[PDB]
């Protein structure tokens, strides 16, 4: 099962995917974060009966555009840890991207003047929780689990690294309002072969290829992890990492321009294209 | 004027708080969080008319219990950054706390086993957003507070430094779930000055001590510097970091306790009293 959230002029649905252009409307529901929260979804998402839509890629929306917790997972992939010159982690590293960051999997980046000059790519699986996970063992944190996506990790490295000098939070430089392509829409675990190549593409170059089984903590080890610090709620994304090859690693240094576009694509996931611009 | 969300059996309410222990129903809102959404907010408190209520400490609920947003600041006391020998940093430390770690002022801190071994206290000012702000400059941010506060940046230490061990990322330390009180209510910015004291007391021994005017990063040099990377929603809250003294940084490490009582209080704001009870 393939759920999106669907924007026709500037109205959003939560939509089954029949095909690559073709979608049933889910009645009562905004987007697929509004679904989630009913324990029926899967059914009701089984008996769409809404308006049939024809939709280009554009007006695909944030597959969940406002989910209440975005955790993002540092240092989840060897040759990344390698490259970022780290120790390969006994425990998950954690930080938060609000809500405002996410954008549709077609959206541009509108850069600012101030945001634009160290603009970096992260090509990561996305975990859609599917309902509420309070101190779930591993064993268990399959059944938390709707399904996945694809979502750029959309870095300004400046502001990353800027506050403290020495340990830097990097929040402030991974939570650019509208600045995280996030879809194209969320595939359900038993509709895909887990553990395929993650590749991203900037202007149609190969700058990251690493399969998503390469993860050092799974996404049932990031529930578990997670889950006995806080709650995730149903419609709450982990963002598991990024493998190695971004920008800031590259051997020149490498980073987004006016007009560059980045593409991220999960084998069995699809893909998303967020093409970067500054600001007018 | 002081705001309040208190709980009334079943129910909880929005109030003006008349004295220490009563207050006046805001008609028609659950929590000042629900009340702030609204435009003319200032004007239903002012004309608050529902029901006197007599409301006891452990009544009081976490001021908004449910903001979008918890930003957190690092460093920003410039005597007690200048005392430890460093720089006064130029941009601020930001990290996110989930509205899941709030509590009462009065609240009892409920901490399970894997948590307990590092805690520690964190008195600050709350800064809570009274409308939309989104690329707010300085000059303009005062406009945007509703109004002030106190909470406890209540810490695992052992969580917040665990990952990646050379740079930590703070917010797996920093969002316990159900750790930090807040309130005890909302002072407007006409009803409070800034210049008095902000003490924490552990078990009634003082253990912080600040003049709250001596910020390197004032609540308008905060609400600019964040709102130029994402929005900041009426009834969101902005926490402007702790002074010296601090469980972590003493000699011996003073750590809480099973059944020790945190005291935040910030002259002119009022104060919070949380006690620590390991979880049976
Ligand atoms: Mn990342
Ligand atoms: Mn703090």
Redesign the interface.
């Given at each position: 099962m393939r759920l999106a959230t669907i924007r026709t002029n500037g109205t959003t649905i939560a939509a089954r995917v029949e095909s690559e252009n073709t979608a049933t409307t889910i009645e009562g529901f905004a987007n697929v974060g509004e679904l989630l929260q009913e324990s029926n979804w899967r059914e009701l998402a089984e008996n769409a009966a809404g308006e049939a839509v024809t939709f280009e890629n554009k007006e695909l929306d944030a597959v969940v555009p406002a989910p209440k917790?975005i955790v993002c997972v540092?240092?989840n992939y060897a040759n990344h840890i390698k490259e970022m010159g780290?120790?390969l982690?006994?425990?998950?590293?954690?930080?938060?991207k609000?809500p405002?960051?996410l954008i549709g999997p077609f959206d541009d980046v509108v850069v600012?003047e101030?945001?634009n000059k160290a603009l970096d790519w992260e090509g990561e699986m996305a975990v859609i929780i599917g309902k509420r996970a309070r101190?779930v063992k591993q064993a268990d944190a399959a059944e938390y689990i709707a399904g996945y996506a694809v979502m750029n990790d959309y870095t300004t490295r400046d502001?990353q690294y800027?506050?403290?000098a020495?340990?830097?939070?990097?929040?402030?430089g991974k939570?650019?309002?509208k600045s995280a392509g996030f879809g194209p829409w969320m595939t359900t675990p038993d509709s895909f072969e887990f553990g395929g190549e993650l590749a991203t593409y900037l202007e149609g170059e190969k700058v990251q290829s690493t399969p998503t089984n390469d993860l050092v903590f799974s996404p049932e080890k990031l529930i578990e992890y997670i889950t006995?610090?806080?709650?995730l709620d149903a419609g709450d994304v982990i963002v598991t990492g990024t493998p190695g090859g971004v920008g800031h690693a590259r051997n020149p240094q490498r980073y987004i321009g006016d007009g560059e576009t980045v593409k991220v694509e999960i084998a069995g996931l699809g893909f998303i294209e967020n093409k970067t611009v500054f600001e007018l």
């Open positions: 917790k540092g240092l780290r120790d982690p006994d425990t998950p590293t954690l930080f938060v609000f405002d960051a600012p101030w945001a101190r502001f800027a506050a403290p020495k340990t830097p939070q990097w929040h402030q939570s650019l309002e006995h610090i806080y709650p």
